[PDB]
A paper describes a structure:
The enzyme cyclic di-phosphoglycerate synthetase that is involved in the production of the osmolyte cyclic 2,3-diphosphoglycerate has been studied both biochemically and structurally. The reaction involves the transfer of the γ-phosphate group from ATP to the substrate 2,3 -diphosphoglycerate and the subsequent SN2 attack to form a phosphoanhydride. The unique structure of cDPGS is made up of an N-terminal domain which is crucial for the stabilization of the active dimeric structure and the ligand interactions, and a C-terminal domain that contains a P-loop kinase fold as part of its structure. Since the cDPGS reaction is exergonic at cellular concentrations, cDPG accumulation is favored thermodynamically until this reaction reaches equilibrium. cDPG appears to play a role in the thermoprotection of proteins, and increased thermostability has been demonstrated for several model enzymes in its presence.
Residue numbers in the entry: 1 to 460
Write the structure that this text describes.
Amino acid sequence: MGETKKMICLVDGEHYFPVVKDSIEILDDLEHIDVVAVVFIGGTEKLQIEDPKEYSEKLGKPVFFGPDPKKIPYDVIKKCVKKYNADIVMDLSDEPVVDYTKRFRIASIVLKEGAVYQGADFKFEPLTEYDVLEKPSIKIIGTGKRIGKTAVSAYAARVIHKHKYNPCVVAMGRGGPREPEIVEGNKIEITAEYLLEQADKGVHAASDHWEDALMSRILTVGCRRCGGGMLGDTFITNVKRGAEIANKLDSDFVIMEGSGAAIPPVKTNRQIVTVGANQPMININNFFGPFRIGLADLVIITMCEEPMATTEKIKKVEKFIKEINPSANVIPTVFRPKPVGNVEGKKVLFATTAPKVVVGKLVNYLESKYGCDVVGVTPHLSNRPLLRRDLKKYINKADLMLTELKAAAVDVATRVAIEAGLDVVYCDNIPVVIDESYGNIDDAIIEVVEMAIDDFKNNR
Ligand SMILES: [Cl-]
Ligand code: NA
């Protein structure tokens, strides 16, 4: 009742019983603490009681045990937290029963159930959660840096828009005003003529909200946060107000996104998680990698090709995701350009900042899939004089310049192409399936949306 915290204590058999009983009795006798249950998590070397009902009677608490003393009983911990609606799991164990890795596995279980996980010198808080959305919703998050989370979220937004779900995006980003701003990405025209104006102001604004709306081409609520935690919380954010704005917009469906590791602290129906095949394995299979993957209804694996990842790296990542989240759908992908408009039969100058080692693959993909002739590649998208010099080589050999759609591309690359009198076709960098034995990415995204709408209708 009141503010008496329901605590579950983790204890081991590498302690003599009186020391364990002493600590449990102290916590049970202390104000504001209710020890609802004890989970014995392993060890037998110091046990002097063989009968577990005796152990429980002498301790004076319900005591839960896994069958194997050599391993952490992760499912017994999860079930105990749910049974007693525990507020805190207090770890009173030590080596050799726990180590760093096992404590992050325990933390991932406890924090997912909305309980604090604490020990002598560490405390982890579960994610802040505001239940504010009055529309069906998904959250799209990532497991690390440089995995193309932005390209995956904007692709998802465009797919959901294309299938007539009338989405909006709430983007909790790295800048913006204190009151969330509405950016009408639905009104943006992907033409050189329209963009010339609006990209310069986007570049110079103290936010990426314009670029978010440019990539998604949907109604965007521009939010901000300062930093992100290890689990994915943030110190301070206006995203709760951004969600309340989304409820009032002409939209039927809400996509919540966050910058970096920061997970929007707004309850959604379903989640998409992006994982990079290029990540250090430890960031996937250790720390809070498994926690994030455990949130997924759909995992998109990115960068599934050399030089970012070997076949062996890609299969280990797929294997790990199936072991921790077997119910999630999983799609492995690579990034490829998708032109916005027709390039079939056209001679193309491909304006791309992609590494030399992958340009060949992208060129072969454009020629084989979209039927263009790539006559040249220029990496000079940010420098006007160098792009001008490049255009001098190609201004008589190319029908158009094919350029990635980013705020930076409009202000520089578009202007110099239109100045040189060369047609401009934009392209999006999109996730493409590499392994037909996994599903269709668009169908996987729409399945999540349908599940979200069903959840929303059934909960009312
Ligand atoms: Cl277990
Ligand atoms: Na107490």
